[PDB]
Structure formats: structure tokens, C-alpha cells
Scaffold this active site. Structure first.
Site, mmCIF file in Angstrom:
data_model
loop_
_atom_site.group_PDB
_atom_site.id
_atom_site.type_symbol
_atom_site.label_atom_id
_atom_site.label_comp_id
_atom_site.label_asym_id
_atom_site.label_seq_id
_atom_site.Cartn_x
_atom_site.Cartn_y
_atom_site.Cartn_z
ATOM 1 N N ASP A 27 29.401 44.780 56.495
ATOM 2 C CA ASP A 27 30.240 44.901 54.612
ATOM 3 C C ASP A 27 28.609 44.226 53.883
ATOM 4 O O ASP A 27 27.736 43.862 54.652
ATOM 5 C CB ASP A 27 30.510 43.254 54.569
ATOM 6 N N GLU A 71 35.755 50.755 48.181
ATOM 7 C CA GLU A 71 35.554 49.708 49.232
ATOM 8 C C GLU A 71 35.051 50.877 50.195
ATOM 9 O O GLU A 71 34.274 49.872 51.466
ATOM 10 C CB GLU A 71 36.422 48.875 49.447
ATOM 11 C CG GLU A 71 36.694 47.962 50.469
ATOM 12 C CD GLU A 71 36.939 46.048 49.726
ATOM 13 O OE1 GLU A 71 37.518 46.627 48.473
ATOM 14 O OE2 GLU A 71 36.333 45.101 50.269
#
EC number: 3.2.1.17
Lengths: 452, 21
Positions: A220, A211
Site C-alpha cells: 500500500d 482505494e
């Protein structure tokens, strides 16, 4: 009141025990002496050094005097030696068990982090003070037994103090609970905390790879504002609303940029939330329970990425994981939209389910340091098996011995052998601490072989 | 070792041969 003949100590056992005692003696003298030279030449060093001092002191104080008392069956020395030898012995024992607890806690504090010589003085002071009752209760008495006149050095049944009179009767329980049970309980407690801490450390590195970690607010791959380790702050498209929610999230905003430690705290909150959500979900809880610590983190990784509802959609793969069909679940997971969308993250997670190790994430240096500390805890396993025969012997004397049961001489005969065996096992532990540490630490193994 | 009383000579002879612990 009659008897059978408790001189016991068959002339054959005297040879075996005194040969075992000589082997443990020189090997314990050599083993702990060379360990001290390595420390004095090259945190955990001084704790192991204090342990070797307690070992060396225990070997020299508890082996020769019992070898003599076995063969000579006599106490030739005065009352001072009768009060000094047990006092030094219980002091060395205290140093040893406290060094092990201080060593284990040191390994826990070394992992949880994400006044050492003071403990040494504290250990040796407390070890001596707790051994003082031995130097007061022991005394020399005489008696006309059978046809001889003997001179005995023992713990006196009569004491000049109500406290000492209690210590004379309950000494073995005080030793069994404090010098055996308490270290085993303390060590097993901090070992459990260390493994739970190492686990939340690995899941951090695991998610940090899959991540990423950002100290400033970012957008993101899906396109949503995120910070830390995949911590969603808000799903609104306004960047101003993200900064407002971020400041409201931490409670002490440094204008929108954090440090490494703050993101770790935020991360542990999300892992706790992910664990609670899994346990609350009827589809995920049974599979999560059957999984090992490693594969549990692989499931938490997926919950991190897709949420509890999305992970619950892998109905076929979750049942395969529950039935421990690792390869079948790996093939099935590779056919998913998840594998096609995020292949790098999926391939590592699938590999983790497939192999049950951290090989796809952690580096070998960290992998080695962890296995040292975790396995070096075996010193307490050896401690538990070496000090059990001696403690069990004194427990049986306070349990099975009854003056009124006339076959008790057969029991005292058996306890004499078990006592001299337990005194060899307890001394073998002081002798095995260098051997076990050499065979385990690898680094110490090359330092040991450098001698000869 | 130790004994309940010094009147138990079987126990006191046991501590005569017993280890110093």
C-alpha cells in the site's frame, strides 16, 4: 325496507362519464398500440409488451360494455356474454398486475447481478385460471321490480358449490388483497431491495476510485500488504506471512490471485464490518444516523481509510455534519492531516459531503440508467391511485350497505357514480402506462416522437 | 355486482345499473 329512489345516474353525470370514457378509450387504444409497434420493430422489452397487451385487452373489454350499460341500462346479450366479459376482464387485470411485478423484479435482478418468456406464459396462464370463478358465478336472472320486468346479468347470490358460494360473498376482498395490496407490497419490497443494491454498487465504485482494486497481493501507500479494495490482510512485514494469511482469509486460495467477483464479495464484508463498527461507536452512530445514503457512504469511505477510531477524532467536523452544515464541515475537513496526506481522496469525499451526490465518482451513463428504473417504478404509484377508487367502491358496498337501513338507496345511488368513475380510473391506468413510460424513459420519448 | 339474496330487489336493481365488475 322503504327507499328513496336509486335509479341515480343523473342525466348530467351520464354525459361527463361517457366523454371521459371516450377520451381514455381512443387515447388508450392509440397509446398502447404504438407502444407495441415500437417493441415489435426494435428482456425488459417483452415485459413492457405483455403489459401493453393487458392494457389494450383491458381497454376494449371494460370500456365499451360499461358505456352501453350506463346509457342503455340493459343487458341485451345472452348468458355466454354475461359469463365471458367478466372472465376476460379479470384475466386482463391479472396480466397487468403480474406484468408489473415481473417488471419490477426484473429491474432488481438487473442490478443485483454483480427464462423471461417462460414467465409470460406463466403470467397469462395464472391470470386466466384465477379469472375462471368469474365465468362460473355470473348468470342472468329476471325480476318484476317496481313497474317493469328486468333482465339482470350479475354475480349470482346462489351457487352450486360451497367454494363458489364463498367466492360470491368474498370476491371483493380477494380482488383487493391479491390484485392491489399484494402487487403494492411485492413492488415496494423489490424497489427497496433495488435501492439498497444500487447503494452498495455506488459505494463500490466510490472506494474503487479512492482505494483502487488489485487482483493480486500488493503493498500500500503506507507500505502494508493489501488486496482487493483496501482489504488489509496483515500488518506484518513478511511477504510470506501475507500469502499465508491471504490463503487463510479466503478459504479457497487460487495461489494468491483472485477475480473481480471474489474481491466484490470481500468488499461487501468490509462494508458490513464498517457499518457495524460505526453503529457500535457512540461518537459515530448519531452522526451516521442523521446522514443521507450518499453521505453515509462518504463516512464509510473515511472509516475504510482511517478506521473507526481515527474518524472519531474529527469531533468538530462530525458535529457540523450532524447539524447539516455542509460547507462549514467541508472547510474544516480541508484543514486536516487527512486532507494534506491524501488530497485526491479527501477532495472527492469532501465534495460528496458538500453536495450530497455521486457526481465525483459515477459516470453519466450509469447515472441515467439508474434514474430510469427507479423513476419507472412510478407505474405502480399510478397503479395504486387508479385502482383505489374502484376497489374503495366495492369495499364500501360490503361495509356501509345494510338492507334494513332505509336510507340505503341514497348510498347505492352514490356507489353507482363511484363505480363508473373507478372503472374510468382503472382504464386510465392502462391508458397512462405508455404516457408515463414515454415521459420518463427519454429513450422511449425519442422513439415515440419518431412517429409523429 | 352481487347481493346477499335475490329477495333484495333494491340491490338487484343496483346491479342492473351497476358496472360489469
Amino acid at each position: 325496507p322503504p327507499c328513496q329512489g336509486p335509479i341515480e345516474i343523473k342525466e348530467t353525470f351520464k354525459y361527463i362519464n361517457t366523454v371521459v370514457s371516450c377520451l381514455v378509450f381512443v387515447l388508450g387504444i392509440i397509446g398502447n398500440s404504438t407502444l407495441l409497434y415500437i417493441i415489435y420493430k426494435n428482456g425488459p422489452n417483452i415485459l413492457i409488451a405483455s403489459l401493453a397487451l393487458g392494457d389494450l385487452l383491458h381497454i376494449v373489454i371494460a370500456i365499451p360494455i360499461n358505456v352501453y350499460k350506463l346509457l342503455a341500462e340493459d343487458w341485451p346479450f345472452g348468458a355466454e356474454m354475461c359469463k365471458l366479459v367478466p372472465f376476460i376482464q379479470k384475466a386482463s387485470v391479472g396480466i397487468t398486475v403480474l406484468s408489473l411485478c415481473a417488471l419490477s423484479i426484473d429491474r432488481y435482478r438487473a442490478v443485483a447481478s454483480w427464462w423471461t418468456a417462460v414467465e409470460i406464459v406463466l403470467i397469462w396462464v395464472v391470470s386466466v385460471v384465477l379469472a375462471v370463478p368469474e365465468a362460473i358465478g355470473f348468470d342472468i336472472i329476471t325480476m318484476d321490480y317496481k313497474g317493469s320486468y328486468l333482465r339482470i346479468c350479475l354475480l349470482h347470490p346462489v351457487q352450486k358449490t360451497a367454494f363458489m358460494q364463498f367466492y360470491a360473498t368474498a370476491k371483493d376482498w380477494w380482488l383487493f388483497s391479491f390484485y392491489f395490496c399484494l402487487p403494492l407490497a411485492i413492488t415496494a419490497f423489490f424497489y427497496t431491495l433495488m435501492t439498497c443494491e444500487m447503494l452498495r454498487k455506488n459505494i463500490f465504485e466510490m472506494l474503487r476510485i479512492d482505494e483502487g482494486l488489485r487482483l493480486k497481493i500488493y503493498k500500500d501507500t503506507e507500505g502494508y500488504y493489501t488486496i482487493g479494495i483496501g482489504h488489509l490482510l496483515t500488518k506484518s512485514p513478511s511477504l510470506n506471512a501475507a500469502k499465508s494469511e491471504l490463503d487463510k482469509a479466503i478459504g479457497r486460495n487460487t495461489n494468491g490471485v483472485i477475480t473481480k467477483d471474489e474481491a466484490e464479495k470481500l468488499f461487501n464484508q468490509d462494508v458490513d464490518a464498517a457499518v457495524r463498527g460505526i453503529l457500535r461507536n457512540a461518537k459515530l452512530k448519531p452522526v451516521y444516523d442523521s446522514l443521507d445514503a450518499v453521505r453515509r457512504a462518504a463516512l464509510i469511505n473515511m472509516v475504510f481509510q482511517m478506521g473507526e477510531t481515527g474518524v472519531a477524532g474529527f469531533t468538530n467536523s462530525l458535529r457540523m455534519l450532524q447539524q447539516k452544515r455542509w460547507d462549514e464541515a467541508a472547510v474544516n475537513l480541508a484543514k486536516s492531516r487527512w486532507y494534506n496526506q491524501t488530497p485526491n481522496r479527501a477532495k472527492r469525499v469532501i465534495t460528496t459531503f458538500r453536495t450530497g451526490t455521486w457526481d465525483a465518482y459515477l459516470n453519466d451513463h450509469l447515472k441515467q440508467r439508474r434514474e430510469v428504473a427507479k423513476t419507472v417504478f412510478c407505474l405502480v404509484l399510478v397503479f395504486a391511485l387508479c385502482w383505489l377508487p374502484l376497489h374503495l367502491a366495492r369495499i364500501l358496498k360490503l361495509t356501509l350497505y345494510n338492507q334494513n337501513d332505509p336510507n340505503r338507496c341514497e348510498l347505492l345511488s352514490f356507489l353507482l357514480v363511484l363505480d363508473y368513475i373507478g372503472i374510468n380510473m382503472a382504464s386510465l391506468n392502462s391508458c397512462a402506462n405508455p404516457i408515463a413510460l414515454y415521459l420518463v424513459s427519454k429513450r422511449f420519448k425519442n422513439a415515440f416522437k419518431s412517429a409523429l | 355486482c352481487s347481493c346477499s339474496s335475490l329477495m333484495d330487489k333494491e340491490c338487484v336493481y343496483f346491479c342492473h345499473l351497476d358496472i360489469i365488475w
